[PDB]
């Protein structure tokens, strides 16, 4: 085989891509799928909607792959990357779902979270798994399912409840599920680090963590934790257009994006833009527990003797949602490209600062009583000024998180790569370079997340020997944005932002 | 002979010592000499005040060595240890200095430093020589002397400029200067690793580095880089009371201190206390370039078919200067022992934390916009609480550097030896033991720096055969401080220190 495939199963879409030995994609196919919102704050997906979304993406890509004259016999292996924390529960016996998957943004577990935070044993969870208690981790999601869904209750007590993040589910069913010789139930170190069940330092399940949530190892079937790159642990695709092709790579989507940007050295960071932002910061071979509310997580675990690598993670809630706000809520323009144009139409922000704290501010600010607050409005303020401030808001929060990441880890920021969404805005990336004082790399190959899983698979099957080889091959209409602004003008702009953040505190009273 | 002599030429004093075969001094003589400070931030010494001082200690100590019944015939060899980075320039053909030596803390090179740091070239220096650009290394001091002192630039162009660190200067004159048959112009690997001229991995001058500073090796006379322990490369003392005694050892003072503590295995560290601290960390035969602003230097190069050993170095500005601050600035007490008594008169710090960032904080924090910040004051805070917080402040910063060295090198801390100044405070060292969680070793033999050079000369000439022999022979108030505190209580104290540090950054706005 000479090519590597990659399944990228996201929150709203699935895609399948096939890469060559240099990381460039030759065949691709994407599929939107249905998300379900039974009540406000609830968010679920049919596990079979996710799987068949993937099989229709494989089918579509390989028809295009076939039109170029290639066969499955040429795909050496595939990797999998997936939306993290999304929780699937199925019957160990029949491999059938016992409930809809609860997707990571679901908030039905709020009450449960407040309950678990009132424990005293909760004080020590951050240090053991790298994450604080919240509505996101798979643990609170699965505990809620057991305590509130009877068919899940029975299976747990009867000893036939199987748990998995989306990666585990996909690999299980792709191998054949219950109807299979050598059934495959596993998860890689990056996905398993998002559940709150795993010790971050040992990369093994921890009974202090399991016991805190009342989950019994010897009742529920937990996926076995394996490296993110392995030639055997994930098995092979049993059926379909890819029958007989081995699965050899598996990575959480935000980890896969960092791998796809070749952020393999301490201090190399990546920002993925969608409705919001996910930022990851390579910290090396020793995990770093945050003093600022950042998440400590696994960057990648490629094995073959090498030590696993960790990362710090931060997130912003409002990045592309800011543009959506300007277009729909305020009616500035009907397309995001015309929003950029309005921003480029003015020289600067006109003194406007948009603290886009629609649901408050998160790392590193942790301000829960502020709402969206717009400063600096005069009779001379125009839509372009506000559009600029909306872009800058994302860049200011990005610096705030990267600053925290430098302080948490002690490494100076070495590089910043960007992909997705708002990264297409030259103006926004240029502002990020200006505000942070660092080159901003934006690859032209836009499917960075999927490439990460392809690298993981290629490394397990000999397409690439080491990570130097990965960098060399990948390296081998604009790419890098370089700072233009005086560093003292940059601090001044950033200090105005922080003044506005402090002034936004205390809006919501009770 | 069975005895070994050691020249310890310090920043403000010279001393000559004679050690027996188990590392105990049998004769000593010390002389304070003249430093000079024409302009603020300038620091100079007459190269003959340094050598004359050395000669007077040799004379003074051999007069006492005679009272014991011994003479130069009983001294197998002598070694030399010295203030590092201090730059000496002299004329090749006459052997007379061209200008006063520039002591290492001189700051006249700052402008030139920011000149050379602006070049993209500078990024490659640290990985090349293990050091970043600063005002300390001899490179910028020599370049300044060439670019700004005509007597030196003229000797440079006329091909008779000779450069040397103090070690090289002393060995050259002791051997007889220019009139000597077989003139000796050399420097040991540890001293040469402080100039920024030497490749750290190869222990040879590097044209790439000499080029960066515009230094022509076919025009300037650089000292030959030799091992720290050699029975012939340093020659012999030409005249005086040690006429005929070979010189066979040479180490930078901080490196000599590590040797004198027998810090020979990876992970063994030492700390020397004065106005501040110099910490060294043995990392083994493979050099380690720091991610946290620490310096990569040579620990010792003992030759004899053994690979050289490297180390990581960190420095703290405020250790004894903190005690001095409490006495003079705040008037707590006229003597240091009373400051200590005040700290001992309370059970703990009373919640007080003193971030002693008088001119900011340095490795591994690197905070340039913080001043001294005292936290936790109530109407119950007394001098003793603030005295304790001052001592803990240097221990906290000490732990922060040792943690950074562990992470950089991969080697767990095996031990910590202390010497000088504040190490005499039983309380401070017990506090360090409590905070770091390991035993703290403090030799009753106080002259650890001078022992290092004696060890080098002894290994060169058979007094000690191997490094194991050294450890055994020198294994023969108080000596060892053991942790009297949980890791959990210690971690709480360190977290509040790090919180104080975080709350101190951002004080200076312009």
Numbering used by the authors:
A (entry chain A), B (entry chain B): 65 to 540, 550 to 583
Q: What is the paper's account of this structure, in its own sentences?
A:
Here, we report the first structure of glycerol kinase from the thermophilic filamentous fungus Chaetomium thermophilum (CtGK). Glycerol kinase (EC 2.7.1.30) catalyzes the transfer of phosphate moiety from ATP to glycerol to form glycerol 3-phosphate (G3P). Overall, the CtGK polypeptide chain can be divided into two distinct domains classified by Pfam as FGGY_N (residues 65–325) and FGGY_C (residues 331–583) connected by a flexible region. A similar case is found in CtGK, which forms extended dimers via the interaction between the C-terminal domains with a prominent contribution from hydrophobic residues (Phe422, Gly436, Phe389, Leu394, Thr437, Phe439, Gly440, Ile441, Thr437, Thr445, Leu438, Ile450, Trp580).
We initially determined CtGK in an apo form using ethylene glycol as a cryoprotective agent. The asymmetric unit (ASU) contained two polypeptide chains. The physiological dimer is not contained in the ASU but completed by a symmetry-related chain forming a rather elongated assembly (A:B’ and B:A’). A similar organization was observed for the later structure obtained in P2221 (both chains modeled for the range 65–583 with a gap 541–549). The dimer interaction is mostly mediated by β-strands located on the C-terminal domains. Although crystals were grown from the same condition, the collected datasets were processed in different space groups. We observed that in the absence of nucleotide, CtGK adopts open conformation, which upon nucleotide binding closes up.
